[PDB]
Every structure is written in C-alpha cells, then in structure tokens.
From Swiss-Prot:
It comes from the Eukaryota. Changing Y239F: Decrease in CSK-induced phosphorylation. The chain holds residues 672 to 920 of 920 of the full protein. Ubiquitinated. Deubiquitinated by USP26. 'Lys-6' and 'Lys-27'-linked polyubiquitination by RNF6 modulates AR transcriptional activity and specificity. The gene is AR. Changing D188N: In AIS; loss of androgen binding. This is Androgen receptor. GO terms for biological process: androgen receptor signaling pathway; animal organ formation; cell-cell signaling; cellular response to estrogen stimulus; cellular response to steroid hormone stimulus; cellular response to testosterone stimulus; epithelial cell differentiation involved in prostate gland development; epithelial cell morphogenesis.
Amino acid sequence: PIFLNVLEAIEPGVVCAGHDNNQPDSFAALLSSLNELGERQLVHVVKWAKALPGFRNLHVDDQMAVIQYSWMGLMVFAMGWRSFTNVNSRMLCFAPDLVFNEYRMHKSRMYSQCVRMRHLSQEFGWLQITPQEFLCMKALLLFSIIPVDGLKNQKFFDELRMNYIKELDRIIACSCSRRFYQLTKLLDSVQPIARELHQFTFDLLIKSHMVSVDFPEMMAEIISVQVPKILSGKVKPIYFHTQ
Ligand SMILES: C[C@]12CCC(=O)C[C@@H]1CC[C@@H]1[C@@H]2CC[C@]2(C)[C@@H](O)CC[C@@H]12
C-alpha cells in the first residue's frame, strides 16, 4: 500500500483564511478573504503536487502548468470534502475562520455557485466516499485539465494520468464497475463548477478596483495569465464521460 501511504502522508493540513469575522459580511471583505485563502492554499497545493508519486517524471514546465490549470478544481473538491467531514455539508467550510452560511452565500454574489458546491459536498455523503477514494480522486484532478495543443511532454503526462486512473481502480477493488462509474461521474462534475468559478473570478479581477476587492500577487498572476487560456478554450478539462 505504498501509494496510499504516500497520499496520506502528503495531504495538506488546515489553512486559515485570515478573515476578520468581526467585520460586516460585505462583498468586498468576503471576496478579499476568499482571494487570500486562495493564495495561502496555492502554496500548499504546489508543495503537495510536487510530492505526488511520479510527478517529477513530468517536464518541469508541465509541472507548473498542470498546477496552474487545475488549482480551482482541486481546491473546490477539497473544500467539499472538508464541508462534508466537518459539518455534513450543511455549510461551506472554506476555512475554519471562513464558513459560509446562507447570508454569506448571498452577500458573496456567488449564491448559485455555492449551491453547486454544496451539492458536490453532499455527494461525498450520498456516495459514501471513503478517505482513500477522496485522496485518489483528488490526485487525479491534478491530471484532468491540459492545453488543446498538448503539454511540453504529453507522453509523460499520459502515462502518469493512466497510472492514477489505475490506482483509483485498485482502491475500488479493495459492483467494482458500478463504483468506478460513480466516482468518474463525480470527478467530471467538478469541472463545470470550476468553469463557473473561473469565469466569476476573471470578471471580478477585471473590475476589482471598482468593487474594492483585493487580489494577492499569485492569484492576480494566475487569473490574468492562465485562467483566460481556459476561458478562451486553449486549455480544456479531460472528461471521462461524454458531456
Ligand atoms: C479557490 C477558493 C479558495 C479555497 C477554497 O476552499 C475554495 C474556494 C472556491 C472559490 C474561490 C476561492 C479563491 C478565490 C476565488 C477564485 C474568488 O476570486 C472567486 C471564487 C473564489
């Protein structure tokens, strides 16, 4: 069980948003706190990804690219699992110091996207996803979004993605076929949610000065440089099933 030992060992711990819960639940304060959480989580996502089995097999340029394409889905999927585990998906647990209730969902101007994130969180309960299945599915999310014109070394990526699909199947083999259908469907469902949030954050970055929303340095870079490749169709999710 080397592979699972590794995924358990490298799993990031708790990250706080730094949100001042004393201030009013305004759009500006909530989204500025979410952006800071994003910057703080990205540090952990990079360190995690670089530690995954096989990741250093990819070209160095491909290593950064897959992180910068996949972070939104990785972070939403992990938040959905934290929300399930902490509060049975009742609220969205972005961080211990930034839990969205109904009011914050409305004030954030993301109510509909939050509804979809809550549905994803609830699937963890409905499907009785185990921690092992969660860890293997989250690793596969890293290898689920790539440029249409290919990566620098596409073959190395294809081999690695194949290996993570095999590991997900092995975890299931510990019926089997039905479970695999369910888990791949759940993985695909993260992508449309990530696309909605990519569009929202891109639009918010462009108008950020007008609405007093702060974007930290790495977030502003990734959202203006890499996110538009996704929104313009140059970088696309790899779906299991026909959409
Ligand atoms: C990835 C984050 C932050 C980390 C997390 O737990 C999930 C969450 C999903 C919404 C994202 C947010 C980062 C900041 C974004 C991108 C905002 O600009 C708009 C939507 C936010």
